[PDB]
Amino acid sequence: GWSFEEQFKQVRQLYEINDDPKRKEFLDDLFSFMQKRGTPINRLPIMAKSVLDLYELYNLVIARGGLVDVINKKLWQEIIKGLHLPSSITSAAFTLRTQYMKYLYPYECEKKNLSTPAELQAAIDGNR
């Protein structure tokens, strides 16, 4: 069974990444909003000696033009390329969008309000 405290200590190493005020303040705001449940994100795996920085995923998403733009254009390949998969490419694309949707879709919309969950379905419906 996967222990919950294991995901908890993984969040502490995220803050230890750097004492930069921008990164520290960002984590306090993002985790605090989703803190409604009280637990961190979905999971935080460890890459060799590096930790999967959530900040990197968000910065890459905006660097593209918006999560909805990425879904409708299906530019998940660009983010997957940065997150080099081992060699099995499991639900790599699917795994990224679901965890983001679980606690980062409201946060992204709150910070920029790129679009509404209504038109998002139009973007998701086209993919299907």
N, CA, C and O atoms as a GROMACS GRO file, in nm:
protein
  512
    1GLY      N    1   0.086  -0.122   0.000
    1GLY     CA    2   0.000   0.000   0.000
    1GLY      C    3   0.088   0.125   0.000
    1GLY      O    4   0.192   0.127   0.066
    2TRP      N    5   0.048   0.227  -0.071
    2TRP     CA    6   0.130   0.352  -0.076
    2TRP      C    7   0.096   0.436   0.048
    2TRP      O    8  -0.021   0.466   0.072
    3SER      N    9   0.195   0.474   0.124
    3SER     CA   10   0.168   0.555   0.247
    3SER      C   11   0.146   0.702   0.211
    3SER      O   12   0.214   0.756   0.124
    4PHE      N   13   0.052   0.766   0.277
    4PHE     CA   14   0.021   0.909   0.249
    4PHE      C   15   0.136   1.000   0.296
    4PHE      O   16   0.171   1.096   0.227
    5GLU      N   17   0.194   0.972   0.409
    5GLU     CA   18   0.304   1.059   0.459
    5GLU      C   19   0.420   1.061   0.359
    5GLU      O   20   0.497   1.156   0.356
    6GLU      N   21   0.432   0.959   0.279
    6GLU     CA   22   0.542   0.957   0.179
    6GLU      C   23   0.519   1.071   0.080
    6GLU      O   24   0.615   1.138   0.040
    7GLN      N   25   0.398   1.095   0.041
    7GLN     CA   26   0.370   1.206  -0.053
    7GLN      C   27   0.393   1.338   0.022
    7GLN      O   28   0.437   1.437  -0.037
    8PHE      N   29   0.364   1.338   0.149
    8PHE     CA   30   0.380   1.461   0.231
    8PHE      C   31   0.528   1.503   0.237
    8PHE      O   32   0.558   1.619   0.209
    9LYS      N   33   0.616   1.415   0.272
    9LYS     CA   34   0.760   1.455   0.278
    9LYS      C   35   0.807   1.497   0.138
    9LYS      O   36   0.897   1.581   0.127
   10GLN      N   37   0.749   1.443   0.035
   10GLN     CA   38   0.791   1.482  -0.103
   10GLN      C   39   0.760   1.631  -0.125
   10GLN      O   40   0.828   1.696  -0.203
   11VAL      N   41   0.661   1.684  -0.059
   11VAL     CA   42   0.630   1.828  -0.078
   11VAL      C   43   0.738   1.911  -0.007
   11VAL      O   44   0.775   2.018  -0.056
   12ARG      N   45   0.788   1.864   0.104
   12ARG     CA   46   0.893   1.942   0.176
   12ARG      C   47   1.015   1.959   0.085
   12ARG      O   48   1.071   2.068   0.079
   13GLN      N   49   1.056   1.856   0.017
   13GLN     CA   50   1.174   1.872  -0.073
   13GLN      C   51   1.142   1.975  -0.182
   13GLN      O   52   1.234   2.040  -0.232
   14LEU      N   53   1.017   1.991  -0.219
   14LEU     CA   54   0.986   2.092  -0.325
   14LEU      C   55   1.027   2.231  -0.274
   14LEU      O   56   1.097   2.304  -0.343
   15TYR      N   57   0.985   2.266  -0.155
   15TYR     CA   58   1.023   2.399  -0.099
   15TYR      C   59   1.175   2.408  -0.088
   15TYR      O   60   1.233   2.513  -0.117
   16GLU      N   61   1.239   2.301  -0.049
   16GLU     CA   62   1.388   2.304  -0.034
   16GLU      C   63   1.456   2.325  -0.170
   16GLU      O   64   1.577   2.346  -0.174
   17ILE      N   65   1.382   2.319  -0.278
   17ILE     CA   66   1.446   2.338  -0.411
   17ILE      C   67   1.526   2.469  -0.412
   17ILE      O   68   1.640   2.472  -0.458
   18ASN      N   69   1.468   2.575  -0.362
   18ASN     CA   70   1.541   2.705  -0.359
   18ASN      C   71   1.467   2.801  -0.266
   18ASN      O   72   1.347   2.785  -0.244
   19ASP      N   73   1.536   2.897  -0.212
   19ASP     CA   74   1.470   2.994  -0.120
   19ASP      C   75   1.417   3.112  -0.203
   19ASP      O   76   1.392   3.219  -0.149
   20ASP      N   77   1.400   3.092  -0.331
   20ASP     CA   78   1.349   3.203  -0.416
   20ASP      C   79   1.210   3.246  -0.365
   20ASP      O   80   1.124   3.160  -0.346
   21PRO      N   81   1.185   3.375  -0.343
   21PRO     CA   82   1.050   3.416  -0.295
   21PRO      C   83   0.938   3.377  -0.394
   21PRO      O   84   0.831   3.334  -0.351
   22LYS      N   85   0.963   3.391  -0.521
   22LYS     CA   86   0.858   3.357  -0.622
   22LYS      C   87   0.817   3.209  -0.610
   22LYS      O   88   0.698   3.180  -0.604
   23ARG      N   89   0.911   3.119  -0.608
   23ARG     CA   90   0.876   2.974  -0.599
   23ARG      C   91   0.809   2.946  -0.464
   23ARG      O   92   0.707   2.878  -0.459
   24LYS      N   93   0.865   2.995  -0.357
   24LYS     CA   94   0.806   2.970  -0.223
   24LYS      C   95   0.663   3.025  -0.219
   24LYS      O   96   0.570   2.954  -0.178
   25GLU      N   97   0.645   3.147  -0.260
   25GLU     CA   98   0.508   3.207  -0.257
   25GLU      C   99   0.415   3.128  -0.349
   25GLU      O  100   0.299   3.106  -0.314
   26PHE      N  101   0.463   3.087  -0.463
   26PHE     CA  102   0.376   3.009  -0.556
   26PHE      C  103   0.329   2.881  -0.487
   26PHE      O  104   0.209   2.852  -0.488
   27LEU      N  105   0.419   2.807  -0.430
   27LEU     CA  106   0.379   2.680  -0.363
   27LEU      C  107   0.279   2.710  -0.251
   27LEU      O  108   0.181   2.638  -0.235
   28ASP      N  109   0.302   2.813  -0.174
   28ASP     CA  110   0.207   2.846  -0.064
   28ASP      C  111   0.068   2.873  -0.122
   28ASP      O  112  -0.032   2.829  -0.065
   29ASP      N  113   0.060   2.943  -0.232
   29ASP     CA  114  -0.073   2.976  -0.291
   29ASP      C  115  -0.136   2.852  -0.358
   29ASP      O  116  -0.250   2.818  -0.327
   30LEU      N  117  -0.064   2.786  -0.445
   30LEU     CA  118  -0.122   2.667  -0.514
   30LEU      C  119  -0.161   2.558  -0.414
   30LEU      O  120  -0.277   2.516  -0.412
   31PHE      N  121  -0.070   2.514  -0.332
   31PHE     CA  122  -0.105   2.406  -0.236
   31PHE      C  123  -0.218   2.454  -0.144
   31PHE      O  124  -0.309   2.377  -0.113
   32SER      N  125  -0.214   2.577  -0.102
   32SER     CA  126  -0.322   2.628  -0.011
   32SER      C  127  -0.459   2.619  -0.078
   32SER      O  128  -0.554   2.573  -0.014
   33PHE      N  129  -0.473   2.660  -0.201
   33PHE     CA  130  -0.607   2.653  -0.266
   33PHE      C  131  -0.656   2.507  -0.268
   33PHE      O  132  -0.766   2.478  -0.221
   34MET      N  133  -0.577   2.419  -0.322
   34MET     CA  134  -0.617   2.274  -0.327
   34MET      C  135  -0.616   2.213  -0.186
   34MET      O  136  -0.671   2.105  -0.166
   35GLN      N  137  -0.556   2.280  -0.091
   35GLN     CA  138  -0.549   2.224   0.048
   35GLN      C  139  -0.690   2.193   0.098
   35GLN      O  140  -0.704   2.130   0.204
   36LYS      N  141  -0.793   2.234   0.028
   36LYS     CA  142  -0.931   2.205   0.076
   36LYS      C  143  -0.939   2.058   0.119
   36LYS      O  144  -0.997   2.027   0.222
   37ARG      N  145  -0.882   1.969   0.042
   37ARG     CA  146  -0.882   1.826   0.082
   37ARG      C  147  -0.788   1.811   0.203
   37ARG      O  148  -0.817   1.734   0.295
   38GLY      N  149  -0.678   1.883   0.203
   38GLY     CA  150  -0.582   1.878   0.317
   38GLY      C  151  -0.455   1.802   0.279
   38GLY      O  152  -0.356   1.807   0.352
   39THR      N  153  -0.455   1.733   0.167
   39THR     CA  154  -0.332   1.656   0.124
   39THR      C  155  -0.271   1.721  -0.001
   39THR      O  156  -0.341   1.788  -0.076
   40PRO      N  157  -0.142   1.701  -0.025
   40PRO     CA  158  -0.075   1.759  -0.145
   40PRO      C  159  -0.146   1.723  -0.276
   40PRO      O  160  -0.266   1.694  -0.277
   41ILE      N  161  -0.074   1.724  -0.385
   41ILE     CA  162  -0.133   1.691  -0.518
   41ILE      C  163  -0.166   1.541  -0.525
   41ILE      O  164  -0.196   1.480  -0.422
   42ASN      N  165  -0.161   1.483  -0.641
   42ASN     CA  166  -0.193   1.338  -0.654
   42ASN      C  167  -0.070   1.255  -0.615
   42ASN      O  168  -0.081   1.164  -0.533
   43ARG      N  169   0.043   1.285  -0.672
   43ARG     CA  170   0.166   1.209  -0.637
   43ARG      C  171   0.289   1.290  -0.678
   43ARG      O  172   0.280   1.376  -0.766
   44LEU      N  173   0.401   1.265  -0.616
   44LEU     CA  174   0.527   1.339  -0.650
   44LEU      C  175   0.643   1.240  -0.664
   44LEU      O  176   0.722   1.226  -0.571
   45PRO      N  177   0.655   1.172  -0.776
   45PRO     CA  178   0.765   1.074  -0.794
   45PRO      C  179   0.903   1.143  -0.789
   45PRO      O  180   0.911   1.265  -0.796
   46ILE      N  181   1.008   1.066  -0.776
   46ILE     CA  182   1.145   1.124  -0.770
   46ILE      C  183   1.223   1.082  -0.894
   46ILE      O  184   1.229   0.963  -0.926
   47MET      N  185   1.283   1.176  -0.962
   47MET     CA  186   1.362   1.142  -1.083
   47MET      C  187   1.510   1.131  -1.046
   47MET      O  188   1.577   1.232  -1.028
   48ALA      N  189   1.558   1.011  -1.035
   48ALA     CA  190   1.701   0.991  -1.000
   48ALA      C  191   1.739   1.079  -0.881
   48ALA      O  192   1.715   1.042  -0.766
   49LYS      N  193   1.796   1.194  -0.907
   49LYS     CA  194   1.837   1.287  -0.797
   49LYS      C  195   1.750   1.412  -0.802
   49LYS      O  196   1.766   1.502  -0.718
   50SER      N  197   1.660   1.420  -0.896
   50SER     CA  198   1.571   1.540  -0.909
   50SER      C  199   1.427   1.503  -0.871
   50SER      O  200   1.390   1.385  -0.874
   51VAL      N  201   1.347   1.601  -0.836
   51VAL     CA  202   1.205   1.576  -0.799
   51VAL      C  203   1.114   1.635  -0.907
   51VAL      O  204   1.142   1.744  -0.957
   52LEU      N  205   1.009   1.567  -0.942
   52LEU     CA  206   0.919   1.622  -1.048
   52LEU      C  207   0.863   1.756  -1.001
   52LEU      O  208   0.766   1.760  -0.926
   53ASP      N  209   0.923   1.864  -1.044
   53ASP     CA  210   0.877   1.999  -1.002
   53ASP      C  211   0.743   2.035  -1.068
   53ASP      O  212   0.736   2.048  -1.190
   54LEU      N  213   0.640   2.050  -0.990
   54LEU     CA  214   0.508   2.089  -1.047
   54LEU      C  215   0.521   2.223  -1.119
   54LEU      O  216   0.462   2.244  -1.225
   55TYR      N  217   0.597   2.313  -1.062
   55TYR     CA  218   0.614   2.448  -1.123
   55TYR      C  219   0.654   2.433  -1.270
   55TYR      O  220   0.604   2.507  -1.355
   56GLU      N  221   0.741   2.342  -1.300
   56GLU     CA  222   0.786   2.325  -1.442
   56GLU      C  223   0.666   2.292  -1.531
   56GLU      O  224   0.654   2.348  -1.640
   57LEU      N  225   0.580   2.203  -1.489
   57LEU     CA  226   0.464   2.169  -1.576
   57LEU      C  227   0.381   2.295  -1.601
   57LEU      O  228   0.349   2.326  -1.715
   58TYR      N  229   0.348   2.367  -1.497
   58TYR     CA  230   0.266   2.489  -1.517
   58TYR      C  231   0.338   2.589  -1.607
   58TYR      O  232   0.278   2.641  -1.701
   59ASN      N  233   0.464   2.617  -1.582
   59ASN     CA  234   0.535   2.716  -1.668
   59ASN      C  235   0.532   2.668  -1.814
   59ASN      O  236   0.511   2.750  -1.904
   60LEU      N  237   0.551   2.542  -1.838
   60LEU     CA  238   0.549   2.492  -1.978
   60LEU      C  239   0.408   2.507  -2.037
   60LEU      O  240   0.395   2.544  -2.154
   61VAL      N  241   0.306   2.481  -1.960
   61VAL     CA  242   0.168   2.493  -2.014
   61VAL      C  243   0.140   2.637  -2.058
   61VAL      O  244   0.093   2.659  -2.170
   62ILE      N  245   0.168   2.733  -1.975
   62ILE     CA  246   0.144   2.874  -2.015
   62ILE      C  247   0.237   2.909  -2.131
   62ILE      O  248   0.197   2.978  -2.224
   63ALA      N  249   0.359   2.863  -2.125
   63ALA     CA  250   0.456   2.893  -2.234
   63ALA      C  251   0.399   2.845  -2.369
   63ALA      O  252   0.451   2.883  -2.474
   64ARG      N  253   0.296   2.765  -2.367
   64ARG     CA  254   0.237   2.715  -2.496
   64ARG      C  255   0.124   2.807  -2.540
   64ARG      O  256   0.108   2.832  -2.660
   65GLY      N  257   0.046   2.858  -2.448
   65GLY     CA  258  -0.066   2.951  -2.486
   65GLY      C  259  -0.191   2.922  -2.402
   65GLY      O  260  -0.294   2.988  -2.421
   66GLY      N  261  -0.184   2.827  -2.312
   66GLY     CA  262  -0.304   2.795  -2.227
   66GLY      C  263  -0.330   2.644  -2.229
   66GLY      O  264  -0.308   2.580  -2.332
   67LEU      N  265  -0.376   2.589  -2.120
   67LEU     CA  266  -0.403   2.442  -2.118
   67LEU      C  267  -0.508   2.408  -2.224
   67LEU      O  268  -0.493   2.308  -2.295
   68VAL      N  269  -0.611   2.487  -2.237
   68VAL     CA  270  -0.715   2.456  -2.339
   68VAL      C  271  -0.650   2.455  -2.477
   68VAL      O  272  -0.681   2.370  -2.560
   69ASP      N  273  -0.562   2.548  -2.502
   69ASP     CA  274  -0.495   2.551  -2.635
   69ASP      C  275  -0.416   2.421  -2.652
   69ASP      O  276  -0.413   2.364  -2.760
   70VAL      N  277  -0.352   2.377  -2.547
   70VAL     CA  278  -0.274   2.250  -2.554
   70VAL      C  279  -0.368   2.132  -2.580
   70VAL      O  280  -0.337   2.046  -2.663
   71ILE      N  281  -0.479   2.125  -2.512
   71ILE     CA  282  -0.572   2.010  -2.532
   71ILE      C  283  -0.630   2.011  -2.674
   71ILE      O  284  -0.619   1.912  -2.745
   72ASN      N  285  -0.689   2.120  -2.714
   72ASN     CA  286  -0.750   2.125  -2.850
   72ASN      C  287  -0.642   2.101  -2.956
   72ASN      O  288  -0.666   2.029  -3.053
   73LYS      N  289  -0.525   2.157  -2.939
   73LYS     CA  290  -0.416   2.136  -3.039
   73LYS      C  291  -0.343   2.006  -3.007
   73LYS      O  292  -0.259   1.961  -3.085
   74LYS      N  293  -0.372   1.947  -2.894
   74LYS     CA  294  -0.304   1.819  -2.856
   74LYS      C  295  -0.152   1.839  -2.857
   74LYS      O  296  -0.080   1.759  -2.917
   75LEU      N  297  -0.104   1.942  -2.793
   75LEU     CA  298   0.044   1.966  -2.789
   75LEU      C  299   0.104   1.895  -2.668
   75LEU      O  300   0.211   1.934  -2.620
   76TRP      N  301   0.038   1.794  -2.618
   76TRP     CA  302   0.091   1.720  -2.500
   76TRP      C  303   0.229   1.662  -2.534
   76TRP      O  304   0.309   1.638  -2.444
   77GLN      N  305   0.255   1.641  -2.660
   77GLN     CA  306   0.387   1.583  -2.699
   77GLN      C  307   0.499   1.676  -2.653
   77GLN      O  308   0.603   1.629  -2.606
   78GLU      N  309   0.480   1.805  -2.665
   78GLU     CA  310   0.586   1.900  -2.622
   78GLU      C  311   0.614   1.884  -2.472
   78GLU      O  312   0.730   1.879  -2.432
   79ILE      N  313   0.512   1.876  -2.391
   79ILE     CA  314   0.536   1.861  -2.244
   79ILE      C  315   0.593   1.721  -2.218
   79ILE      O  316   0.685   1.706  -2.138
   80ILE      N  317   0.540   1.621  -2.283
   80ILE     CA  318   0.592   1.484  -2.263
   80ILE      C  319   0.740   1.480  -2.302
   80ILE      O  320   0.820   1.412  -2.238
   81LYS      N  321   0.776   1.552  -2.405
   81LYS     CA  322   0.918   1.553  -2.448
   81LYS      C  323   1.005   1.606  -2.333
   81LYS      O  324   1.110   1.549  -2.305
   82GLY      N  325   0.962   1.711  -2.268
   82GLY     CA  326   1.043   1.764  -2.154
   82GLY      C  327   1.045   1.659  -2.042
   82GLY      O  328   1.150   1.635  -1.982
   83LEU      N  329   0.933   1.599  -2.016
   83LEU     CA  330   0.926   1.494  -1.910
   83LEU      C  331   0.964   1.360  -1.974
   83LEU      O  332   0.887   1.264  -1.969
   84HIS      N  333   1.081   1.354  -2.032
   84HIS     CA  334   1.128   1.229  -2.100
   84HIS      C  335   1.080   1.103  -2.026
   84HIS      O  336   1.117   1.080  -1.911
   85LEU      N  337   1.000   1.024  -2.092
   85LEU     CA  338   0.947   0.898  -2.031
   85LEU      C  339   1.057   0.791  -2.034
   85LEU      O  340   1.150   0.801  -2.115
   86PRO      N  341   1.050   0.692  -1.948
   86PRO     CA  342   1.154   0.585  -1.947
   86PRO      C  343   1.166   0.518  -2.084
   86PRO      O  344   1.263   0.539  -2.157
   87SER      N  345   1.068   0.438  -2.118
   87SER     CA  346   1.069   0.368  -2.249
   87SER      C  347   0.943   0.282  -2.260
   87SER      O  348   0.939   0.188  -2.340
   88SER      N  349   0.841   0.311  -2.182
   88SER     CA  350   0.714   0.232  -2.188
   88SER      C  351   0.600   0.327  -2.221
   88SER      O  352   0.492   0.284  -2.263
   89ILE      N  353   0.624   0.453  -2.203
   89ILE     CA  354   0.521   0.557  -2.232
   89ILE      C  355   0.382   0.509  -2.187
   89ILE      O  356   0.292   0.498  -2.270
   90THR      N  357   0.366   0.482  -2.061
   90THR     CA  358   0.234   0.438  -2.012
   90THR      C  359   0.135   0.550  -2.041
   90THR      O  360   0.151   0.622  -2.139
   91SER      N  361   0.035   0.566  -1.960
   91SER     CA  362  -0.062   0.675  -1.984
   91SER      C  363   0.011   0.809  -1.960
   91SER      O  364  -0.037   0.893  -1.884
   92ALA      N  365   0.124   0.828  -2.023
   92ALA     CA  366   0.201   0.954  -2.003
   92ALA      C  367   0.112   1.075  -2.031
   92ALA      O  368   0.090   1.158  -1.942
   93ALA      N  369   0.060   1.087  -2.151
   93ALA     CA  370  -0.028   1.203  -2.183
   93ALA      C  371  -0.151   1.201  -2.092
   93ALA      O  372  -0.183   1.302  -2.029
   94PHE      N  373  -0.219   1.090  -2.087
   94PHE     CA  374  -0.342   1.080  -2.003
   94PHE      C  375  -0.310   1.106  -1.855
   94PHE      O  376  -0.385   1.176  -1.788
   95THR      N  377  -0.202   1.052  -1.805
   95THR     CA  378  -0.167   1.073  -1.662
   95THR      C  379  -0.143   1.221  -1.633
   95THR      O  380  -0.184   1.271  -1.528
   96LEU      N  381  -0.078   1.291  -1.722
   96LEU     CA  382  -0.050   1.434  -1.696
   96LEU      C  383  -0.179   1.517  -1.691
   96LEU      O  384  -0.202   1.590  -1.595
   97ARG      N  385  -0.262   1.506  -1.791
   97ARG     CA  386  -0.389   1.586  -1.794
   97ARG      C  387  -0.480   1.555  -1.674
   97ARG      O  388  -0.540   1.647  -1.618
   98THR      N  389  -0.493   1.431  -1.635
   98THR     CA  390  -0.586   1.399  -1.522
   98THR      C  391  -0.538   1.462  -1.390
   98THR      O  392  -0.616   1.527  -1.322
   99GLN      N  393  -0.413   1.444  -1.355
   99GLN     CA  394  -0.365   1.503  -1.227
   99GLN      C  395  -0.378   1.655  -1.235
   99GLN      O  396  -0.420   1.718  -1.138
  100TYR      N  397  -0.344   1.712  -1.347
  100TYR     CA  398  -0.355   1.859  -1.361
  100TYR      C  399  -0.502   1.898  -1.341
  100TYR      O  400  -0.533   1.990  -1.266
  101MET      N  401  -0.589   1.828  -1.408
  101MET     CA  402  -0.735   1.858  -1.397
  101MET      C  403  -0.784   1.842  -1.253
  101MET      O  404  -0.868   1.920  -1.209
  102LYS      N  405  -0.734   1.745  -1.181
  102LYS     CA  406  -0.784   1.722  -1.043
  102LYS      C  407  -0.763   1.845  -0.953
  102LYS      O  408  -0.852   1.876  -0.873
  103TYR      N  409  -0.651   1.915  -0.961
  103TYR     CA  410  -0.632   2.033  -0.869
  103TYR      C  411  -0.569   2.155  -0.939
  103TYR      O  412  -0.557   2.260  -0.876
  104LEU      N  413  -0.529   2.146  -1.064
  104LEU     CA  414  -0.464   2.265  -1.130
  104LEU      C  415  -0.556   2.332  -1.232
  104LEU      O  416  -0.525   2.442  -1.276
  105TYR      N  417  -0.667   2.273  -1.270
  105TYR     CA  418  -0.754   2.344  -1.368
  105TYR      C  419  -0.823   2.464  -1.302
  105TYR      O  420  -0.840   2.567  -1.368
  106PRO      N  421  -0.863   2.456  -1.177
  106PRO     CA  422  -0.929   2.572  -1.112
  106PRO      C  423  -0.826   2.680  -1.081
  106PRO      O  424  -0.855   2.800  -1.090
  107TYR      N  425  -0.708   2.638  -1.043
  107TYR     CA  426  -0.600   2.734  -1.010
  107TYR      C  427  -0.560   2.812  -1.136
  107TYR      O  428  -0.551   2.934  -1.132
  108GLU      N  429  -0.535   2.743  -1.244
  108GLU     CA  430  -0.497   2.813  -1.369
  108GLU      C  431  -0.607   2.912  -1.406
  108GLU      O  432  -0.579   3.028  -1.434
  109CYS      N  433  -0.729   2.866  -1.408
  109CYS     CA  434  -0.842   2.956  -1.442
  109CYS      C  435  -0.848   3.072  -1.343
  109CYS      O  436  -0.874   3.185  -1.383
  110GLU      N  437  -0.825   3.045  -1.218
  110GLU     CA  438  -0.831   3.155  -1.117
  110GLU      C  439  -0.720   3.257  -1.143
  110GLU      O  440  -0.745   3.377  -1.137
  111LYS      N  441  -0.601   3.212  -1.172
  111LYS     CA  442  -0.489   3.308  -1.195
  111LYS      C  443  -0.507   3.386  -1.326
  111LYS      O  444  -0.479   3.506  -1.329
  112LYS      N  445  -0.552   3.323  -1.432
  112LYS     CA  446  -0.566   3.395  -1.564
  112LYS      C  447  -0.707   3.382  -1.620
  112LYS      O  448  -0.745   3.461  -1.707
  113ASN      N  449  -0.785   3.286  -1.576
  113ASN     CA  450  -0.921   3.270  -1.634
  113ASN      C  451  -0.908   3.265  -1.786
  113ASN      O  452  -0.970   3.343  -1.858
  114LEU      N  453  -0.828   3.173  -1.834
  114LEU     CA  454  -0.805   3.162  -1.981
  114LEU      C  455  -0.937   3.134  -2.053
  114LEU      O  456  -0.962   3.189  -2.160
  115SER      N  457  -1.020   3.052  -1.996
  115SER     CA  458  -1.149   3.018  -2.063
  115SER      C  459  -1.248   2.967  -1.958
  115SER      O  460  -1.222   2.979  -1.838
  116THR      N  461  -1.361   2.912  -2.000
  116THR     CA  462  -1.462   2.862  -1.902
  116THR      C  463  -1.475   2.710  -1.916
  116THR      O  464  -1.452   2.657  -2.025
  117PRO      N  465  -1.511   2.638  -1.811
  117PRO     CA  466  -1.526   2.491  -1.823
  117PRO      C  467  -1.622   2.456  -1.938
  117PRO      O  468  -1.623   2.342  -1.986
  118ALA      N  469  -1.702   2.550  -1.980
  118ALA     CA  470  -1.799   2.524  -2.090
  118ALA      C  471  -1.723   2.506  -2.222
  118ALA      O  472  -1.733   2.400  -2.285
  119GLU      N  473  -1.650   2.605  -2.263
  119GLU     CA  474  -1.574   2.594  -2.391
  119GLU      C  475  -1.469   2.485  -2.377
  119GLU      O  476  -1.427   2.427  -2.478
  120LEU      N  477  -1.426   2.456  -2.257
  120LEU     CA  478  -1.326   2.348  -2.238
  120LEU      C  479  -1.386   2.218  -2.290
  120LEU      O  480  -1.316   2.140  -2.356
  121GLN      N  481  -1.511   2.194  -2.262
  121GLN     CA  482  -1.574   2.070  -2.312
  121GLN      C  483  -1.567   2.072  -2.464
  121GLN      O  484  -1.544   1.968  -2.526
  122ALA      N  485  -1.587   2.186  -2.523
  122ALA     CA  486  -1.579   2.193  -2.671
  122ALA      C  487  -1.438   2.150  -2.713
  122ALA      O  488  -1.422   2.079  -2.812
  123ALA      N  489  -1.338   2.190  -2.638
  123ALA     CA  490  -1.199   2.149  -2.672
  123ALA      C  491  -1.183   1.999  -2.646
  123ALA      O  492  -1.123   1.928  -2.726
  124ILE      N  493  -1.237   1.952  -2.536
  124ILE     CA  494  -1.226   1.807  -2.504
  124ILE      C  495  -1.312   1.725  -2.600
  124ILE      O  496  -1.271   1.618  -2.645
  125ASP      N  497  -1.428   1.774  -2.632
  125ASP     CA  498  -1.518   1.699  -2.724
  125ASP      C  499  -1.449   1.678  -2.860
  125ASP      O  500  -1.459   1.570  -2.918
  126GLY      N  501  -1.380   1.778  -2.908
  126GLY     CA  502  -1.310   1.764  -3.040
  126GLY      C  503  -1.208   1.650  -3.032
  126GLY      O  504  -1.194   1.574  -3.128
  127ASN      N  505  -1.139   1.639  -2.922
  127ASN     CA  506  -1.037   1.531  -2.909
  127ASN      C  507  -1.106   1.395  -2.925
  127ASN      O  508  -1.049   1.304  -2.985
  128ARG      N  509  -1.224   1.381  -2.872
  128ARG     CA  510  -1.296   1.251  -2.883
  128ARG      C  511  -1.366   1.244  -3.020
  128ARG      O  512  -1.432   1.144  -3.050
   0.00000   0.00000   0.00000
